[PDB]
Every structure is written in C-alpha cells, then in structure tokens.
Amino acid sequence: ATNYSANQYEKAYLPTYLQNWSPARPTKEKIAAHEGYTQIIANDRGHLLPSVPRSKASPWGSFMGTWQMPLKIPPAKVTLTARTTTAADNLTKWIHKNPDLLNACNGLRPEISGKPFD
Amino acid sequence: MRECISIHVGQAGVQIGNACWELYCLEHGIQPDGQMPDSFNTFFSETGAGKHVPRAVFVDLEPTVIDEVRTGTYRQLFHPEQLITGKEDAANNYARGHYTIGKEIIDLVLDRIRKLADQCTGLQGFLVFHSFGGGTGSGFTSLLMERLSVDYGKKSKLEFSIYPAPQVSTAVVEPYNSILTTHTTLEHSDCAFMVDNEAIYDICRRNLDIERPTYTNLNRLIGQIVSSITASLRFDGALNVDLTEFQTNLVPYPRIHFPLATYAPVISAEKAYHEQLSVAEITNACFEPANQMVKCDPRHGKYMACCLLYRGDVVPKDVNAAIATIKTKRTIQFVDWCPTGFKVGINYQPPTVVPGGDLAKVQRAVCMLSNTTAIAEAWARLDHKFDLMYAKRAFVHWYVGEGMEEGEFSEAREDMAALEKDYEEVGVDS
Amino acid sequence: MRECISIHVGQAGVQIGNACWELYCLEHGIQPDGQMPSDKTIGGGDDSFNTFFSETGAGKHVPRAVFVDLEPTVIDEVRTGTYRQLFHPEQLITGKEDAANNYARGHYTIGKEIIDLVLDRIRKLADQCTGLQGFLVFHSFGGGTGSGFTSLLMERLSVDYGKKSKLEFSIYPAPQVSTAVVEPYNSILTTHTTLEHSDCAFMVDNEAIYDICRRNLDIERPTYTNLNRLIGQIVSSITASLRFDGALNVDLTEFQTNLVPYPRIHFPLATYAPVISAEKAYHEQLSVAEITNACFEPANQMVKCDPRHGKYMACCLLYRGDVVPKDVNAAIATIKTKRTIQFVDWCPTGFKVGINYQPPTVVPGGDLAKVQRAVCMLSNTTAIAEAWARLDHKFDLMYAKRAFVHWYVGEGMEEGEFSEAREDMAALEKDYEEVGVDSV
Amino acid sequence: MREIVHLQAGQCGNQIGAKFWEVISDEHGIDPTGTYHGDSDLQLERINVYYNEATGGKYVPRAVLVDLEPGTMDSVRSGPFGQIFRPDNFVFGQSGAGNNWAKGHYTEGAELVDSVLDVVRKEAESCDCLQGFQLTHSLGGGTGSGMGTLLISKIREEYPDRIMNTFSVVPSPKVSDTVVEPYNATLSVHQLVENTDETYCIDNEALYDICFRTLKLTTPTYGDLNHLVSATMSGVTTCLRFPGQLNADLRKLAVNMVPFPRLHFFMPGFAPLTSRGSQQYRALTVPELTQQMFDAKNMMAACDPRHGRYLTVAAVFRGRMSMKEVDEQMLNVQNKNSSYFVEWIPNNVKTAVCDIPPRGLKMSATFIGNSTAIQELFKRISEQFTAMFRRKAFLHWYTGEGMDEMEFTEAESNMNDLVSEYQQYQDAT
Amino acid sequence: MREIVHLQAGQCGNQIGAKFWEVISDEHGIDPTGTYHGDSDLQLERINVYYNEATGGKYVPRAVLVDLEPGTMDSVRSGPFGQIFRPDNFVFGQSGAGNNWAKGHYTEGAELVDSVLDVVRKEAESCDCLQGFQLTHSLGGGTGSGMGTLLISKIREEYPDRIMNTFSVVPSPKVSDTVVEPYNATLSVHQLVENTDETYCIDNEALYDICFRTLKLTTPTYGDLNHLVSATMSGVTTCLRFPGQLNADLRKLAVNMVPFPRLHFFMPGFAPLTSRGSQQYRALTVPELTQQMFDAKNMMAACDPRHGRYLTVAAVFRGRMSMKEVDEQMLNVQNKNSSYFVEWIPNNVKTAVCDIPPRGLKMSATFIGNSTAIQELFKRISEQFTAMFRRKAFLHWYTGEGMDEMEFTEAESNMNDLVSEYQQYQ
Amino acid sequence: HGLPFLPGSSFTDSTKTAFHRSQTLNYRNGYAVVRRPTMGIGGDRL
Amino acid sequence: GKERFHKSQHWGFCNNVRMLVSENKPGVGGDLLYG
C-alpha cells in the first residue's frame, strides 16, 4: 500500500493527530502523471515475468523480532555537537556497523545532525 | 428472497451447525419447536402449519452424531430428511470417504439440495462446513464440490474449514488427507475462510479467561462469524454486503483463495466494564496477530486484500478515520500491486447474546476477512509432513486397497509444489 | 491532553507507585473503587484528571500506569488490597522468578524474557493520549530488575520512540548504609548504559530522607511508608502545573532544557522545603521567602552530599500554594547575595521559576502539616562529582580481586563489559572537573 | 413544461435519492402521503418539474429506482417517505452485482436494462417539454457503475439532444471502500467522458471534512452527508421552479461552463453552511456567501484548485439581494486572485439569482467550478490501475464473463489523454 | 476606518492580553456578555478601531490569542470576560517549547505558523483601512519570543507598509525567570531590529517598583501589574478613539520619535497613579501630571534616563485641560533640566490632547521616550550571552535542532552594532 | 453593581477552593471541537 | 422499528410477473398507514 494526501484535509490525518505516538508511515505529497496503456508486468496466477528485473530484497517483509534484534542497540538521537572527534567517530561507527537494524520495517530511523569539535 | 443453503458435512460440520442454528432461532423469534410466538427467509421457510423449518442439510456417515440432534432440544425444528446418516464411517481415510463409502450417499444429498433450491426465489449461494482432518469432512466434501459445479454452475460456493493446527492434531494420517483434498478442490471452490482449533484455544484462554475450554466454547465463536457474514441480508444497514461481494474482493487469482478470519471485540463480561469499545479500538485489534484465528503471523508476509464487516452502533467517519491509521503504520505492509486494499460494510443490528454464552453483551463489532502471503508457511510446514511419511511409503496400503490408484500421491504432491512457488512470486517486486 | 505514562519497576517502584496513586485519588475526587462521588453537574464537570486517569464510558477512571516486577509477592498485595478495583488487571506485570541482585540476570537472561510483553502494554497506554508530555520511570539502582531490566527499558524506548522525553526518578545507593553487597557492580553498569539513552534523572537516597523524618517531622522510626509519602509530594509538585491552575506554567520539557547543559551531565538533585510537623507549625509563619531559603540548606537536602562542596549549575524552583509573584522575586534576589552559595561562572542567569495556585494536599493519617505554601526544587550541582568517587572506590575494591564476577560472566554476559564501563565512568569523573574550572 | 426525470442506481443512488426526495417534498409542502399542505401559492405553480399529478390531489414523483437486488429498496420503502414512490418504478433483479463491473455491464445488467428503459420511456413520454435526466450513482460498486453507465449509453443513443446530468461519488484518496475500485472507476470514467453532458464529482472525505470542521457535528451519519448532497442537488435546478431576477437553467449553466466537449467534470460547493452554536458570531450577507463558496477547503471534490486554474466558475444565488453586490464580488475575487484564473477567458464567472430562499434561511448560494486541477483524481486512479493491471491482480474475475483484454488498455489510454488535455489547457499561454 | 488588529503570544501574552480587553470593554461600556450598556454616544462612535461587529447588537474583539500548549488559555477562558472572544481565534498546539527558542522558532512553531496566518489574513482583509497590528509577548520564554518573531517575520513580508508594534517584556537585571534567558533574548532582539516599526521595553521589576513604592500595594499580583501595562496600551491609542483639541495616531508618534530606522526601543510611563491615603492630600492641576510622567523612577523599563540623553519625547493627555498650560510645561522641563536633551533637535517633545478621561479620573497622562540610556539594556544581555556562549553552555539543546554556530555570531554582532549605533549620541 | 473595572475596585474571594478549568477545546476523530463553556473556573455557574 | 429491524418482503414475482405481492404487510415491524 501507499499512503496518500487528502489535499485540503491532511491535518486531521496527520499520524500524531490520530493518537499514534511512535514512528509512522510517510505519505505521498506529490502524485506523478503518466499516459498511455500500462504494460502487464506479471503473467497469469500472479507470477512475475522472467525478464522483469526483480528486486534484490527479501519476499517476506523485514520485521526484526526480539531474539533477532541486535544486542547493544544504538540510540535513536545522536547529535554530534559538543563531542570529541574520536567519541563522535565511535558513535557513528556504532550506527554504521548495524545495517540490519536501520533497514527493517520496524527499524530505527536515527538522527545524525551536526558536526563534532575537531 | 436472498436465501442461503447451509451444508454441514462431518462431525465437525454437524456440531458447528448445532451452535449456528441455536443462534439463528434466537436472533429471530423462533422457539425450539418451530413456532414463532419477516427477515427469517434467508434461513427459514414457513409451512402452512405455522412451523418454520430451516434451509440446511446435515450429512454424516456415522449415526452417533446426528442421533443426538434427533433426541435433543431441537428435535421438532428439523425436517426428518434434512439429517442424513450412513452406517459405517470413513475412518480418517480419504479413499473410503471418496470412492467406496461416500459414493453410496452422494446421490441422496443432491436429491435434498435440489428440493431446497426449488423454494428459494433468489438464492445467493451455498455454504460448506467441514474439517480437513476427518474422513467424511475431507473425502465426501471433495465429492460434493466436484458435483456441485456441473449441476448448479456459477453459483457461489463459500466454505469454512478447520485447517490443521501447527502442533496439535487428533490423528496420525491427517497430512495425507489435508493434501489430497486441497489438490482436488482447488479448481472447484470460490473462497475458503479458515480457522484452526489451536488459535481459538489461545483466544478463549487469553481473551476470555476460560482455562480448559471445550468444543462448545469454540462452536459458539464460529457461529458469531457466520452470523456477521450474512448479517446484511437480514437486518437493515447503511452499506450492504452480499455473498457475491466476497469472492470479487479477496480472490485476486483462481489458485489463491485462502483468506483468514478475525473477530475483534471478543472479551469477557468482567472486562467490558473496564474499557470503551469504540470503532478505532476494534479496528486496530483485527490486524493484531495475537487475535488472529490461524497460528500464522501476517507481519512475516505481505497483505493482499481486506474486507471489514462492521456491525452495530457505528458511524461512517469513525470507520474512515480508523482505516487511515492502519494505512500509515509501517507494520501493516501491502503487496506491490494492491494500492486500494479495503472493502467496508456497515450494519445496524448489534450482536445477539446467547444464554449460557461466554462473550459479553457488546454494542459494536468487526469481522475481518484478510488475504495474506503469510499463509505460505502453513502449506510449507504441511508439505514437510506429507513428504516425511511418504518418502518411505507409510500408511499407503490403507489408501490403495479401496478404489484408489497409487499415482494420486505423486500428482497431488507435484501440484501443491507449484502452489508454494505460486505464493512466492506474487509478492515479488518489479 | 497533557497525559503522562507512569512506569514503575522493581519492588521499590511498586511501593512508590502505591504511595503516589493514593495521593492522586485523594487529590482529585476518586474513591478507592474508581468511581467519583456522583458528579452532580451537567455533563462532565471537571476533566482535570486526564493527565493521570483515563475514563471509560460508565464513569470509571483507570490510571495510566504500568507496575513491573519479577517477584510475584510484591504485586499480590496491590491485586488484593484496598485499591484492587482501581487498577485494570493487565497493567500489573509479574515474573515467576526474580533477578536476584544481578544486573546480568536482569539484563540478558530474565529481562529479555519479559521486555516485549511490557512494551506492548505501553503502546496501548500511549495510543490513548491526545497529547503526551513524556514518560516517568521509577526505579532503584540496587536491585536486579531495578538496574538491569530498567536500563534495557530505556534502550528499547529510544529505538521505538525516538527523542520522546523519558524522565526518571531513582534511588541512588546510600553512602554509609546499604541493603546489599553487590550494589556497586549494579550501579556502575547501569549508569554506563543509560547514559546516552536517558533525558533527565533525579536522584534521592534513603539515608537522607531518614535524616528528615526523624528530625524535621517528629516521627521516630520511619518505615518506607513515610519515605514513600514524601516522594509522592515531589512528583505531585512536578506535575501540578499540568492539572491545576497556575500563574506560571511549567511542563515536563522545561527541566531538561534548563538543568542539563552538557550531554553526559543529566543528574539533578531534589529538595522539598516545608516538611514540618503539626506541633511545630502552630509556631512558624510560612511565608514565601521563609521556605525559599530552606531548599538551599544542606540539612534539608534530600541526598547525602553537600551542595557547598560544589557549584550550582542551574536551579528549578516549584512554588505551590498561596504565594505572590513578587515575593518569589523578593527571595531569589536575596539568595544570590550570599557567598555561601556559589553559581558556576558560565551561568549568570541561574534560575527557573514556577508558581501554582492549588495548595498541597493533606492525606488522612499522614505525616506533614496542613501548610498553605510550599516549594519544590530540582538543582544540578558539581557536588555530585564526590558521589561517583565513592562508587569508583567500591567498584575497583572488589574488582581488583574479581569477587562476584562469576555471577555475571556465566549469566549470559561477557567479561570485557566490566573493564570498560568503569573506564567509561573514568571520563565522567574528569568531565565533571573541567566544568568546575573558571574561564580564565 | 420543463420536467426533469430522476434515475437512481445502486445502493448509493437509492439512499441519496430517498434523502433528495425528502428535501424536495419539504420544499414544496408535500406531506409523507402525497397531499399538498403548503403555505404560499408559489409552492404549487411549477410543481410539475418533479411531481406527476394523480387523481385526488396526490403528487407522485418522476423517479425511477434501479437495483440488482431488492435488499436496499426494502430499506427505502421502510423509511419515512417510502410511501410516496410509485410501486412500479422499482426495478430489481434476483442476484447481486458483487462489486463486479463486468457483471454490472454485460452479464446481469443486460437482462434488466430493457425493463428500466421501458419505465423511463414511459415517464419521458408524459412530459410536455422534457429537459433531461439526472443520474445519481457510485463509481465503486457493480450496480451503480456498470449498469448505470449501460443506462447512460442507452439513454443517450435514443434521446440525444436532451440534458444528461450525473452526480457521481468518485473514489476517495485515503480509504477505499472496495479493493477493486480503480478498475470500476477507470472503466466508468471512460464511459462518462463520452456520454455525459455534465458530471459533478463528490468525495466522502470532503463530505466528512465539511461535516466536522464547518457544521461541527460530533457524530455525522450518511443521513447527513446525503443531506449535503441533496441540498446542493436542488440548488442547481431552482430557476426552473421559482421566479427570479436572473434565471438560469441547466442548459444555460452547461453553455456558460464547458468550453471544450471532453471537459465536463465539476467541483461543487454550498455557501451558507454554518455551525451549531456559532450562529451568533457570523453575519449572513453576500460577501459572507462569496468567501465561503470560493474557500478551497469547501469543495466537495478533494482536489485543490490552487494547483490549477479555474477554467470557468458558476454561482447560483437564492434570496432577495442586490445586483451591485453580487456582480461586485464576482468581479472582485477575480481581480484579487489572478494566478488561479486562466487569461484566454477574460471573465470566468456566471451568476444567476433566484428569489425564494430555502425554508429556514434568508440567503443561499451554490458554486460549480470547472478547473484544470481535477486531473489529480484521474492521475491517482491511473497510477493505482496500472499498479494492479500490470500484474493481473484481480483480473480473472473480470475476464471470466467475456471481457476483452484490450478494454483496460483503451480505457487507460483514453483517461491518460484526457489528463494530457487538461494539462495542455493549464499550460496554454 | 483606522483599524488595529491585536495579537498576543504565549503565557505572558495571554495574561497581558486578557486584562487589556477588560480595560477597553469597560472604557467603552461592554458587559461580560458583550452587549453595549453605555451612558454616552462617544462610547460607540469610534468603537470599530478594536471591536468587530457581531450579530444582534454585540461586539467582539480582534484578538488572536496564540499559544503552543492550551493550558494557559483555559484559565483565560474561565475568567469574568471569557465569553467575549470568538472561539475560532484561539490558536494552540499539543506540546510546548520548554523555554527553548529553536523549538519555538524552527521546529514546533513552524508547524503552527500557517494556521495563525489564516486567522490574521481573515481579519486584516476584513478592515476598511487597516492601520496596523500589535503584539504582546515576552522575550524570556519559548513561544512568546520563539514563534512570536516568526509571526512578525512572516507578516512583514505580506503587509510591508502598515504598522507593527510590539509591547515586549525584555528580561530582568536582578532575577531571571529562566536560566536560558540570554540565548533567547539575544536571538530575538536581533530579529526585532529589522522587523518592527516600534517596540516598547518592559521589565518586571520596574512594575514591582511602582506597586510597592508608589501605588502602595502590600500584595501586588500580576493582575495589578498587567493592569499597568494595559493602562498604557490605551494611552498610545486614545486619540484614535476619542476626540481631541490636538490629535495623534500611532503613525504620528512613530514619525516624531525615530530619527534613524534602527532606533525604535522606547520606555513607557503613566502619570496620575497615587498611593492609598494620599489621594485626599493631592493637588489636582496640570503640572502635577508633568511631574509623574517625567519622574525618573516610574518608567516601566528599569533603565534610568539619568545615564542617557532623550532623543525624542512623547506625551498624551486625557481630559479637558488648557492648551496654554500643556505647552507651558514642555517649555519648563526642557529649559530647567537641559543636560538630558540632545542638541541637534531643538524641540524634542511631541504633545497631544485627548478629551475623554478614564472613568473616575479628572485627568490623566501618558509618556514615551527614546533614549541612549536604553542601550544599557542591550549591553547587559550581551555579556550574559557571551559569558554563557564561550564555554558552549546550553547549546546542544539549540544546535540539536539543526542550528548553525555562526548564526549565534551575527545575533551577537548585530546587537553589538546597535549598542554602538545608539552610543554615538551621548 | 456600579463600580468601574479600575485596578483597586476588584475584590478577591478568599473562600474559593476549586480552580479546575472546564475543557471547552477538545479533539474528536482528528477534528478540533469547540464546546461553549457552561461552567467557569472551579465550577462557578457562568 | 427502534429495537427490531426486520425487513418484510414487499416486492416479488407471482404467476411469472412483477407484482407488489404483499398489499397487507408491516413496515419494519410496525404498520404502515393502511391499518
């Protein structure tokens, strides 16, 4: 699915405005146009065609469980200002060495804003 | 007009049809002797003697289940030929229930359906209740759905089934049956909502506080899902949904017709006191994997279609707002090729409490029928256990020696080995 | 709006939660069975309770709390007590076997077993709030589930909830008395792993609250019931600008931006001034400037370290009762003129004031007096740099011979996490040093 | 003398039709049994635009109710005004549509279109000088979309000079009440664009938003959203029914509205809608109707006109007012806002003034806008349609009744070319 | 005809802006319900400057009450005059600022600026000839200072030649009611330099030094300190609303005050306030309104003009007094005490006489003065910024919203320029 | 009755114990709902 | 009705024509104006 935008009335459907205080699914602000006849990318009974370039990702969606979640989870916010360069480097390496946490469906969407003191 | 003919096959079909029909008598005014002390026509048909007789056919191959109906409370309600019994059962065998024993009784059930199809003016379609594990629920039922198609045509053939559970099971020889009936009904059935007994055991233990439940606590919950599917043919509504509306919105492909079932506000009467039960609270709990009715987790697959059946004191904007919160969450993820997703239906008659029941008296309700790719484990686990015994030819002499060629084990395992690839490629991107 | 989700963890957290929620029921109109005495107005009369209490359809108010433990014997007198009908039963989570003063049992083995059950319950209470200010955490460093699982509560809160404000009250271990023997291994390892994950962290210790009940109140032999009553009168005064009418309002967001200047330094210390006895309020006039001076007094402090050893990094004054906004000014200007208080060089502004109209509440059979004005305070001081030095002292003591380390290594946890979480704290001891230097 | 025949299809069309006929009966003083009980004499003069006269002073409406099963017309009969509809004007079948456009168009709806055409030809050959037909229907179901467009095609092959006017409940952007909507929406838009003279677009998210932020109903129902639709439905045909100082019928609105034949989809709005208890904060004058007709959060269409350019605008006023104020404001908004108005049309607004305000009000006004910012509807439907259609998502249900495979192709090419036509007239100099 | 659209921001703005509508309503004869119950015809002749007309002969103010969390406007609604406001005018968010400027300026305020500029645009275009706006706000806070500068920034780009006033409450020299004051107040004077037409400075100790020393109030609440702010919000705007032997609107005091456009920070006052038992001792003449406008202890700004030079002076009078006697004292104070007046303007004082006194009073008098003794308000905030800033004190609460470090550098340096721009004339 | 609303002409009631605000501003299903105040601060009958 | 909401079948076929086959039937449980 894709969320969309009730153009006038997006403010009642803002996710914090429907009492959902966590990370949420983003919406499509601008709808792109196209014309003509759309090619049937998939043959009958739902098979994708052979020469259609399939995505590299998994077929089943990436939900990270509890016994699958990495030990020593990095923080959600990490602003690097008022830090030493080596400590900020260790924080960014901590964020870097866990690509499976940051890519999941229920994954950590972190914050790296700012520059540490040299 | 707008009638429905229920067909109940097997002990798991008869004993569900004792708790479905106890509700329908009581939801209308009907006493258990047939007398009312005009919305009943979808399930009842008035005789000139004042006596309402249901549109149903009970089938079994063993007399010890229907002879409880002929002696119990509802012995005057049922027509004496609407309850059919054999003399020998099928004994957890596909071959006996399909060829040798089921053939002597298939030509008499189609006599009874032909009479019950000659009284309905506008007949919506049939309903089947059976169990995959049994001998007559799996062998005879796959002989009804082959002969229903050529005799009636494009009539809707919905079905409810007790799919096998991931750990618990009655019988040993249940994976031979659960494959040999999925292969031979896969082209002859329209839609197959599935519950399994283990996930309803984990709801009556957890949602209601009924430790050690019994089948009569399970046959009553299924009767509250069948009641909310045909709830818009009887009671006045704001968005009606027929029995024709379900195949067109949940079956994207003719080999993929296995949805799941969820009924949201199942609570006890000591917890309806504590919580408000608004439209958003019951919508959010259909999509919750703790409240599903099969032990398969929709988070580990992609949704394909949904169908929400609201019922009670509901309002159109609280339906529209609560869906748009589901469409925003990152955990409800849809397939590449389904951008709309939903079907809604709003009724007015609030659910009816049964004396002796378990659920509370409630004011709103949701029944959701969702089609998911997450069922791919349910066939792949069952495919292990067919393959595990059949690799060294176990229990096969109980199937070859009664009217069945041996090659139906290799083709019914070849054929469903395409169904596992069939689920896999329809969720794959472009 | 203005909702707050309380999370109580440990036997300390439960027994503090029983103290606070009796105060909140009396402070609004709620009976012990949930109901109000009937509202006798048209429609809903007063909706002030919505920060802490929800409401069903029928007129029953259920708190926004989660009570957590790993031993069954502590919640089973919440479940069969006077307030057994107030709490929705699923908010009270118990284990079957406890963590047994091990951080490692409470973090890796038993805490991970029970983490995903209670992070489903805090979703449900956080999807009932139209505007959520931030959580509250009530724990003690000493125990297993008060240190181990509580530190892992904060870590999985940061992943799921982002930069949402997660306050915490805590019982820091006492300097002289102590319940247990293994408390320095617990207290070091949890201040290391909550350090980048927690927003603010107020501390008291039980030995200092012993010094007030015996001395200021005339109650010899205070049980933990008399200590937990005073903790509820600090949490109430932090959150009474959210429920009752104020002249200056303060949220739960204005404490982190006004006492936490630097990322590793989020340790303010609580104080509550007119805690007095009913034989000795017959004699004393309690003005607005008479109770301001008694938050800066080293006797009436609520931790066993003297602020005079260090420098006041900031303050936060919470005035509650029948006060004047001009006599709040008329006392702060006096305090700055003394040379026995010393603000840090780079903080020339100092303060943060809050004025609220509802006077503090009298609990029937409680300790204090019916007082008409009161002051609460959360101040951040350099004088806490003497508190880790008495915890580096008792970690390196038993660690140089490696006592009790086998009770954490075989309990699902490697051994190099010991010799880095005391090296991690070793920077914090010099980090409190350089903010103690003046900018020459 | 200028009769208007009504056609209701589907359950959406039946409920909207029941509420609309309740509105007209209130307006002309027809009680729930059929006898006139009115006050003025203007209520009875041009009653023949909607009401046929029977013996004994009973007024039976000129409406035809169509469905594929009678499960909705049981509910229509059991209402308050169910006894005024003639029993023979109800057409029903035995089996439902099942949210299937193919079963609505080819299989089931073909055996019913003959009976419906017989009924509407009998009502049309009783009008002295008929003006045209209204259809109220939904583009998501099977009876409303499929059979409704079958009726529109077979009406406009036989009465090809009269007015065809549709009120269509097009799909909503956030929540879709059917998984298989955009197939039916595409295959109905492709028929509407050839065979209708006017089509108004109605969205339920827009109706919910008006009943929450402006009327401030705590629990709105469909029995209120239908009141909004009916109140703007019976405001475009007032000047056929009541006197005025500047009359305008539906032909005149079409003539001044549509500049090119493929461009006839409109966005409605209704002016004096005001809150429950905020009546004492708001005056009721002509500028207070203008600033609320033209407010972009007042459209019933869920498309923002600030993305595009108003090709034409119409305003239909009710009440006793001043021509200087009316023409002053319809010039004033054009001069103050001149990036949302095209320049190759120098004046864009057509104004009509009728005399009799609705029963309860002092003034009223209705707005019908024709914009090149309605193409977002078709671009969104085109993108969801190609997303499902490239993978044969639900395609077996449609294919199994004799539908071709080229029909989806030609429908999506037609809608995409209509989108490009809108964008050409937006970007024209 | 000369309409003024009022704005008020935050928990200081909604406490100043609630008493101000309780001093104007009784000035014009308006009940708690809203109806007119007056005893003249001047009380209704020019009421459209502040009051919109409603239905049924009822009047509604043009207040746009703005806040970032609605707790401090539930108290405003429950007062004795809470029903006079149109409820659509209330603007409010869910979670506040925490006395943080950036959260109010960049992060949380910016999600609430487009809902405010629907309300003002619905009222600024419902005026026959709009004269200008106002704003009552405090520089110490988070939503007064924070988004209240975003409001002036995003309406000077839509109505760029009208009037924009602000009644600031700039911080205090002894006791500071927020630790993080010098970051907010330095970063907000820097916005007000290039974005306001006028701005009045108010310190809250100078309001304390009246009600103790002069009014003799033993317990002065902020009710009796908001009542002094609202008794000079009406003196500046009286000659609009009430007839005169000599008139002065808002523009004419602006023309005759600012010699250069960077120099628009003034210091108010209000004369005829008197103590409790000393009302029967008072002489009632005209030169005893010139004593207490100009008395160097009763400014509302906590900046003594003895350190500085009066660049210009205003004076607004309320009563039926004599034009010889009003002009005589302006010749008197300029020619006794002429070390406090600049030399390249030979008559610094602008005068104005309204005719309709406040109710119960026989005369009244109001003052506005532009000084070089007001640059010392801007020196003191600089060293408490740049002491706090050279050791990077609270900056992670601010830079963690994405700010730059050199943005703090100019708001220091722009305020350092206006310190030395004022300091030429002394 | 009959006193002007000047500073000093206003009496404070010292007997008032209730200071709660009536919720006149609420959200229902994502929309802001304004209720007219029937009751003042503390439950005082407006 | 207001507790029961039964829909009585008013229209239908008899002798293979469309008819109003009821002609004496209730509404949603209560009578019509034919009582």
From Swiss-Prot, chain B:
Record localization: Cytoplasm, Cytoskeleton; Cytoplasm, Cytoskeleton, Flagellum axoneme
Record PTM text: Some glutamate residues at the C-terminus are polyglycylated, resulting in polyglycine chains on the gamma-carboxyl group. Glycylation is mainly limited to tubulin incorporated into axonemes (cilia and flagella) whereas glutamylation is prevalent in neuronal cells, centrioles, axonemes, and the mitotic spindle. Both modifications can coexist on the same protein on adjacent residues, and lowering polyglycylation levels increases polyglutamylation, and reciprocally. Cilia and flagella glycylation is required for their stability and maintenance. Flagella glycylation controls sperm motility. Some glutamate residues at the C-terminus are polyglutamylated, resulting in polyglutamate chains on the gamma-carboxyl group. Polyglutamylation plays a key role in microtubule severing by spastin (SPAST). SPAST preferentially recognizes and acts on microtubules decorated with short polyglutamate tails: severing activity by SPAST increases as the number of glutamates per tubulin rises from one to eight, but decreases beyond this glutamylation threshold. Glutamylation is also involved in cilia motility.
Residues engaged in binding Mg(2+): E62
Required cofactor names: Mg(2+)
Active site: E245
Transmembrane segment boundaries: none
Catalytic activity: GTP + H2O = GDP + phosphate + H(+)
One Pfam family named in its UniProt record: Tubulin
Superkingdom field: Eukaryota
Keyword Metal-binding: yes
Modification Phosphoserine occurs at: S430
Modified residues (3'-nitrotyrosine): Y273
UniProtKB/Swiss-Prot annotation, chain E:
Domain of life: Eukaryota
Chain ranges for the short sequence motif MREI motif as given in the UniProt record: 1-4
Cofactor: Mg(2+)
Keyword Nucleotide-binding: yes
Major localisation: cytoplasm
Binding annotation for Mg(2+): E69
Family statement drawn from the similarity comment of this UniProt entry: Belongs to the tubulin family.
Protein name: Tubulin beta-4B chain
Organism the protein comes from: Mus musculus
Gene name as annotated: Tubb4b
Swiss-Prot record, chain F:
The organism of origin for this protein: Mus musculus (Mouse)
Positions of region (Required for its localization in the mitotic spindle and interaction with alpha-tubulin): 1-39
Job description of the protein: Microtubule inner protein (MIP) part of the dynein-decorated doublet microtubules (DMTs) in cilia axoneme, which is required for motile cilia beating. Microtubule-associated protein which regulates cell division and neuronal migration during cortical development. Necessary for radial and tangential cell migration during brain development, possibly acting as a regulator of cell morphology and process formation during migration. May enhance calcium influx through CACNA1E and stimulate programmed cell death. Overexpression of EFHC1 in hippocampal primary culture neurons induced apoptosis.
Name recorded for this polypeptide: EF-hand domain-containing protein 1
Tissue: Expressed in adult brain including hippocampus, cerebellum, cerebral cortex, thalamus, hypothalamus, amygdala and upper brainstem. Expressed in soma and dentrites of pyramidal neurons of the hippocampal CA1 region, pyramidal neurons of the cerebral cortex and Purkinje cells of cerebellum. Highly expressed in testis, trachea, and oviduct, moderately in lung, and slightly in brain. Highly expressed in sperm flagella and tracheal cilia (at protein level).
Source organism superkingdom: Eukaryota
Gene: Efhc1
From Swiss-Prot, chain G:
Cystine pairings recorded for this chain: none
Source organism superkingdom: Eukaryota
Subcellular localization: Cytoplasm, Cytoskeleton, Cilium axoneme; Cytoplasm, Cytoskeleton, Flagellum axoneme
Subunit structure of this chain's protein: Microtubule inner protein component of sperm flagellar doublet microtubules.
Function: Microtubule inner protein (MIP) part of the dynein-decorated doublet microtubules (DMTs) in cilia axoneme, which is required for motile cilia beating.
Name the UniProt record assigns to this protein: EF-hand domain-containing family member C2
Naturally occurring in which organism (per UniProt): Mus musculus
